[PDB]
Design a protein around this ligand. Structure first.
Ligand SMILES: Nc1nc2c(c(=O)[nH]1)CC=N2
Length: 267
């Protein structure tokens, strides 16, 4: 065994229900946040700087209704999907720096085939590849079912980069973004409850595009009030400004570490 296998979290679209999905997201959230280090009632992800390799990643094991499995690799510090495993092959996106590259070499070390994509896994790159913007890509248990399938078959000829990228985007939003925002989790749930597959509307998109921004503002907020009004989008695309963290409490679940935990006020 490799020195301490990273925590594995399983999930399966086989007979997915709102309940099972909620459980899935719960586990993910509980595996990322340190527990402590909370700003204005919102848990903050651990700082990468002093994070040992062993406590760096979380593995999300995705099973399919047709006996297929894909093990995703989530970065604890930001809930970023760095790569995945399919049977005996492992694929990772192109890292942005030496630090991450050094960390990636510890994921799926027992696989026989290791591959590092020339492109990065960031939305902008993936959208170009998929030849489709997120707002035109449907989400739901169905799309996820198909997503897992594509990722798995990438290792067996049935590749098609556009599909591969599309699948990644689907999985990212329904997992990483879902854990990040309680709001997004709800969107996916509504889709599951009624067995629906629909593209994410502007309110969802903007949240994804503003995660880091919100995290910064909340951590640098004068006791709760934002130093500057952060504009956001509604379901209809309309814009509105958020002036206080209170409004965002039941919305955002996780935040990326920014400012050092102030006079560490936890008890
Ligand atoms: N790989 C990857 N993971 C993500 C995001 C992204 O853009 N890319 C957003 C959240 N998790």
């Amino acid at each position: 065994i490799f020195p301490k296998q990273y925590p594995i979290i399983n999930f399966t679209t086989a007979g997915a229900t709102v309940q099972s999905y909620t459980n899935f997201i719960r586990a993910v959230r509980g595996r990322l946040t340190t527990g402590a280090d909370v700003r204005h009632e919102i848990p903050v992800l651990p700082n990468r700087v002093g994070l040992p390799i062993n406590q760096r990643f979380i593995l999300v094991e995705l099973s399919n209704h047709a006996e297929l499995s894909v093990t995703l690799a989530l970065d604890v510090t930001n809930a970023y999907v760095v790569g995945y495993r399919a049977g005996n092959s492992a694929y990772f996106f192109h890292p942005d720096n030496q630090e991450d590259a050094e960390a990636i070499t510890h994921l799926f070390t027992d696989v026989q085939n290791r591959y590092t994509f020339a492109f990065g896994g960031n939305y902008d790159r993936l959208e170009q590849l998929a030849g489709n913007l997120r707002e035109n890509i449907e989400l739901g248990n169905g799309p996820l079912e198909e997503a897992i399938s594509a990722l798995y078959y990438y290792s067996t000829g049935g590749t098609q980069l556009p599909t591969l990228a599309r699948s990644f985007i689907i999985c990212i939003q329904m997992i990483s973004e879902a854990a990040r925002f309680q709001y997004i989790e709800g969107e996916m749930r509504t889709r599951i409850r009624y067995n629906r597959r629909s593209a994410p509307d502007p309110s969802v998109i903007t949240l994804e595009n503003s995660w880091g921004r919100l995290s910064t503002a909340i951590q640098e907020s004068n006791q709760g009030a934002f130093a500057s009004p952060i504009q956001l989008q509604r379901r209809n695309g309309s814009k509105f400004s958020v002036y206080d963290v209170s409004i965002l409490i039941p919305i955002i679940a996780l935040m990326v570490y920014r400012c050092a935990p102030p006079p560490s006020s936890q008890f």
